[PDB]
Amino acid sequence: QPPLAPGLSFDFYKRSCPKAESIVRSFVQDAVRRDVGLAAGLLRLHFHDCFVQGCDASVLLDGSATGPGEQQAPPNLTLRPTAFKAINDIHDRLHKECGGTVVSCSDVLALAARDSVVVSGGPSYRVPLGRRDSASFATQQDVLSGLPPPTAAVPALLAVLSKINLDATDLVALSGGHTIGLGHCTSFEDRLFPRPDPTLNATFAGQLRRTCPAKGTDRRTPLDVRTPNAFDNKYYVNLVNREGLFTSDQDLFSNARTRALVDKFARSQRDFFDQFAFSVVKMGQIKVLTGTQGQIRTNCSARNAAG
Ligand SMILES: *[C@@H]1O[C@H](CO)[C@@H](O[C@@H]2O[C@H](CO)[C@@H](O[C@@H]3O[C@H](CO)[C@@H](O)[C@H](O[C@H]4O[C@H](CO)[C@@H](O)[C@H](O)[C@@H]4O)[C@@H]3O[C@@H]3OC[C@@H](O)[C@H](O)[C@H]3O)[C@H](O)[C@H]2NC(C)=O)[C@H](O[C@@H]2O[C@@H](C)[C@@H](O)[C@@H](O)[C@@H]2O)[C@H]1NC(C)=O
Ligand code: HEM
Ligand SMILES: *[C@@H]1O[C@H](CO)[C@@H](O[C@@H]2O[C@H](CO)[C@@H](O)[C@H](O)[C@H]2NC(C)=O)[C@H](O[C@@H]2O[C@@H](C)[C@@H](O)[C@@H](O)[C@@H]2O)[C@H]1NC(C)=O
Ligand SMILES: O=C(O)Cc1c[nH]c2ccccc12
Ligand SMILES: [Ca+2]
Ligand code: NA
């Protein structure tokens, strides 16, 4: 593992709810079997939360920008509704199984993301626990400052990541999250219209134009054209074929700082999986609340209102 943030530990709930991790995994395994895309939704939700203020469940709050109440966001800042619901359903199950409110929503996010990776065929890894839940709503400015757009090139991505102490190795490995899940036409339409972006494989560009025949097409397509739902290194095989979906994907292969790692991971899924496991655990410790800071929410969608 990477270093543990102060206040976090492996198996934090060993005494207070030893079954907690097992309960989350069982729920995710069943839920994803019914709704395959939920795994991508849960992984994304953990990333997104971490990049918006810190890994503190701020984005779960009804009232947070990009939260479950959000009606005034663009398609690519409108997160999958089933993933918000799954976190709450898991947290409800934990209330019953733990004998009360014990496990933070922030910890559920980190666990559910790991279980999503695993059920999709990805690597298992230990998740540090002990996070606590923010009582601050995320604002639009928090979202816009924290999250790079898919139009961003590597230097801009690295600048954002450096503020949260992630480097180019983490960028390339973590971007492999796009080995599962969906993207909206509007996140990549500028690469098609008016003319095709020269960095896009021309054969793929032709296929995407059926998928998104004009700007403003309200449709989603897999991030990974090779294996949409399997967690694997095919994301990187796409890049080396110039078939990354977003600018922020394909620039990983273009840019001198990141190209070697893209090649490495396209050639070795084991190398990708090892680095992903390290980097995603690093990501999930960004600006965490620990000790008595923050709350253990009784309802992941609301701040606790009675102490
Ligand atoms: C723009 O996108 C196109 C797809 O939309 C690319 O076309 C594809 O290119 C790939 C190679 O990159 C072709 O697949 C290969 O086909 C040959 C002949 O059948 C196989 O021998 C070869 O398998 C070997 O190499 C693999 C690594 O590349 C190894 O993993 C494998 O074990 C073998 O050692 C390979 O076959 C693929 O192997 C992996 C399997 O999972 C997969 O199912 C199998 O297909 C592919 O046939 C081709 N498809 C199309 C529709 O043309 C295109 O690539 C460029 O253009 C093509 C025509 C070829 O000249 C490529 O060599 C070339 O890179 C890409 N344009 C880019 C990359 O600029
Ligand atoms: C840091 C640079 C990143 C950028 C620019 C980026 C951008 C985006 C965009 C634009 C989408 C599609 C949204 C849409 O159009 O609806 C998305 C989806 C997704 N991203 Fe990222 N991403 C980044 C990093 C990450 C990381 C670090 C992970 C996880 C490790 C991740 C996992 C996902 C997943 C799984 C989806 C699909 C969600 C779904 O299907 O519900 N991304 N990404
Ligand atoms: C958990 O907190 C949520 C956020 O406060 C509650 O959701 C909401 O309830 C309000 C009605 O009291 C409503 O105005 C908001 O629109 C809504 N927000 C969202 C995103 O749904 C939620 O309460 C429940 O579920 C909603 C849909 C209603 O049926 C309520 O009567 C339910 O209590 C809270 N969940 C629980 C179990 O308390
Ligand atoms: O199809 C919808 O409207 C639900 C939705 C919102 N954002 C999403 C991201 C990925 C998959 C589905 C959705
Ligand atoms: Ca895949
Ligand atoms: Na957050």
Residue numbers in the entry: 34 to 340
Quote the original article:
We have purified pure cationic sorghum peroxidase from the Nigerian Sorghum grain variety SK 5912. The purification profile, using cation exchange chromatography, revealed a single basic peroxidase, similar to that previously reported for a related sorghum peroxidase. SK 5912 sorghum peroxidase shows a high degree of sequence identity to other class III plant peroxidases, Figure S1. The overall structure contains 306 residues and closely resembles the structures of other class III peroxidases—namely barley peroxidase (BP1), with an RMSD of 0.652 over 306 Cα atoms, as well as peanut peroxidase (PNP) and horseradish peroxidase (HRP). The class III heme peroxidases share common structural features, including four conserved disulphide bridges which are also observed in the sorghum enzyme (C50–C131, C83–C88, C138–C333 and C218–C245).
A notable difference between the typical class III peroxidases (HRP, PNP) and the sorghum enzyme is the position of the distal histidine: His 81 in the sorghum enzyme is much further from the iron (Nδ1 to Fe distance = 8.16 Å, compared to 5.9 Å in HRP). In the sorghum structure, a water molecule (W83) is found in the region that is occupied by the distal histidine in both HRP and PNP, and this water forms a hydrogen bond (2.75 Å) to Nδ1 of His81. Since the SK 5912 sorghum peroxidase is isolated from source (i.e. directly from the sorghum grains), we suggest that this IAA binds to the enzyme and is carried through the isolation and purification process. The class III heme peroxidases typically contain two calcium binding sites. In the sorghum structure there are also two metal ions, and at the same locations as found in HRP and PNP, Fig. 5a, d; in the sorghum structure, these are assigned as Na+ (on the distal side) and Ca2+ (on the proximal side) binding sites based on the ligand coordination geometries. The presence of Ca2+ and Na+ ions at these sites is consistent with the Ca2+-dependence of the steady state and pre-steady state kinetics above. It is probably the case that the catalytic activity of the sorghum enzyme is dependent on metal ion incorporation at these positions, or even that the activity is dependent on replacement of the distal sodium site with calcium (which would account for the calcium activation).
